[model samples]
Every structure is written in C-alpha cells, then in structure tokens.
Target: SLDQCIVNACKNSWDKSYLAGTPNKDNCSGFVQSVAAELGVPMPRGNANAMVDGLEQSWTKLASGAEAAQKAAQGFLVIAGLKGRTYGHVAVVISGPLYRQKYPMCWCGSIAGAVGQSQGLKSVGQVWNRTDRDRLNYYVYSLASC
Candidate 1:
C-alpha cells in the first residue's frame, strides 16, 4: 500500500498536539516534514517558502494552476503555502473528501497554536482564510521523481 506508511505516520498519535516550540515544533512545516520522512520523501525542515523551493528541486512540482482533487487522487503530494509578512502558513492534502467549497481536505498545523489533522482542521484554504490565489500557490511532489 503506497499510503500505508503515510496513514501510519499521521495517525500514529505522535504529532497530535500543539507543542510549545520548534527548531521543528508542531506546526505546518513540521507535520509535513514528519510525514515525508515516513514515506522516504525528502522535505525541508523549515518554513513555507523554503518548503516550496526545496520541493520544487527534489519533488515532482505540478503545473502552475492544477486541479487540487485531481492531483491528490493521482498520489501527488499536495502542498499549499502562503508567504505573508514575517510569517507563513503551509499545509498538505491528505486522503480525504473535498470540503468547504471544492477545497481539498487538508492536514495542517499552525503558528497560532493550532495542531491539524489529528487535532481537527479540514478546510485547506481556511488555514489563513485569505485565499488570495496569488499568495496561495499550489504545488505537488512525488517520491518516485525525487
């Protein structure tokens, strides 16, 4: 099962809380990095912008304006990032239904002390609630290509 390791790592109950701090704390970037490790995928242990750049290098980055659900079903690693003032938010698409108006269900942690997935957060765009489309760029990754 390709999603075996993925499901295990996520539901492992290891990252199911809001941690106090992070050199890699329990935030968006941290959760993604943790999952990527279990699947043997190379991901950055940093913030949103760094995530995008690194993934583009090693992962199979999809087209500029790709369909979210379509790519997720294809097993493409879906990542959404918003580079904002001094702080950024990032999240990953997981195996779930699309909710909150055609947006793919996402697993995300936050700078606001919100722990995602196991902790509860379904809407991807609601992470920041801005949905500027310009700031919210969609990217994808795959282990085989990396």
Candidate 2:
C-alpha cells in the first residue's frame, strides 16, 4: 500500500521542465519533497545536504550505505555529495518489479543530463555521477513525523 505512494510520487514529480528552470529550478529537492509530501511527511528545504541538515533530530538515521534505505519499509530517503548549485542528488526508495538487489529502485529529480539513462526511476546504485556508493547517507522517518 505504502510502496504505491512512492511510485505515485515519482510519476507525479517527473518533469523535463524542472531543469528548464521554468516550473522549478531543481528537484533532487523537489522530488524528495514531493515524495515526502505525498506521504504526508513534509520535510525541510535547501540543497540535499542542507535539507538533510534541517531534518528533525528524531528522524531515524541510517548508516552510510544503500542497503538499509533499500530495505526500509517506508519514508526512506538518501543523499550523495550535495552540489553547490542544486545541492546534488537525492532520491527515495520504492518496491516493484523494477529494482536492484544491491540497490533499491528510487524516484529522483532532474536527470536530463545522465549519459546512460535519464528515466524518472533509477536504481540507487546508478543514481549519481558525482557520488558513488561510498558517498551515500541514508535516512528513515516515520509517516507524518515531519
């Protein structure tokens, strides 16, 4: 039931124009914001790291790995080196036929530049160019806790 929310969040937030700076300048924030909002758990704003910094101290923090976030039941979010511009990359976990064992399938924002694939959905393992697996920091929050 909840996983469907994650999927819907992705579908709803996916927009090519986000990068055009028309609708919104960036997502990695918007996408994660969209997902959390969709789940009724609105979060703080700013770059991915800044956003993370704003998160309430009570929210669950995951180890620096994708495994826990991938395995989390709901309200899972992750970030990798924030860019000075849009605050780098951020995404959320979802369960479906499309997923990677080592990494979870997630919904992210503004990937119009990925050389490989720019699909709205991506495996956490293949999500960021500037960040590898080592740069990932996972976080889990309860529903509506934000």
Candidate 3:
C-alpha cells in the first residue's frame, strides 16, 4: 500500500532514459508531495524532497571516516531493471508496518514506470541498500530484517 501510496501521490512519471544524475523535470518536492499525500504524511509546503535528501546527507555527513564507513555498510535498496545505457534507479528503506509481501518500492524511483515490492512488512526499519556493478546498477532493498 505504501508503494501504491507513493505512485498515487507522484501522479507523474520521470524519464529515466536520460543522462546519469540528471534531475527529473518534476522536482523532488513534487515527487514527495504526491507520495506524502498518498501516505497521509504531512510535509512542510516547500521542497520536501530536498529537505528529506538534505536530512539524509546531514546525518551521514557529520560522521567521521570510521563512522561513515560503518554507516555505509548498510547499503540501501537498489531498484534495478532500467531501459537503456543510463537507467533510472533508487535505494531506500521502509520504516513502518507491513502492507504486503514484496510490495513495489520507489521512494528513490518512479511511481508508474517500474513497480517492485518490499521484501515484506516485517523487513522495515532496515536500510534498503543497493550496489553498483557492470553497466547496470543493482538494487538490493532490505529483505532480511534484524
């Protein structure tokens, strides 16, 4: 449901066939608004995606080499299966109740383009990390929980 919530909220599609690290025509805020609305999560009426991204960066930025290295150990989810040379991808984790087993995940990805599922509801509160290899980026969101 959360994944659907994100899709319903996004209400738009981002073209992942473009260049690497290209910002979507739909800004991060727009994406977040859609997802938040669907999830019933209230965000300040501003750049919610930027804010969330900033927050994530801030948390990891403050850490020293050892701390940051340790944190990186828990790689986030890796949303895979892109179309072309530069495919779109995302990595994230769900921190709430179980909606279903293998629900589509796209916090860092698209709403309608590619749909995937969470490992399960019980797998929340863990980092859905990803890894990059070869030409295609590999997605590896949390499937096993602590």
Candidate that scores best on lDDT:
1
lDDT of each: 0.56, 0.52, 0.30
lDDT of 3 by residue, 14-126 (tens): 33312235333323334434443444544334343334444343322312222221222333222222222232323233323322332222344332232322222212112
Clashes of each: 1, 3, 16
**Stretch of 10 with least lDDT, candidate 2:** 16-25
Q: Write the per-residue lDDT of candidate 1 for residues 1-146, one digit (tens) a residue.
A: 44334445555423543224552335667776766666566666567677766765666555433365456555656676666666666666654565545555566666676433323246565555645533566667644211
lDDT-best of 1 and 3: 1
Give a tens-digit lDDT track for model 2, residues 28-102. Answer: 666666666655665777656677675534456666344454444343443322343644566665553333445
What TM-score would you give candidate 1 relative to the actual structure? 0.69
Best by TM-score: 1
lDDT of 3 at 74: 35
- Scored against the true structure, residue 5 in model 2 reaches a CA lDDT of 52
Off by over 4 Å in 2: 16-26, 56-58, 64-86, 96-100, 111-121, 129-131, 144-146
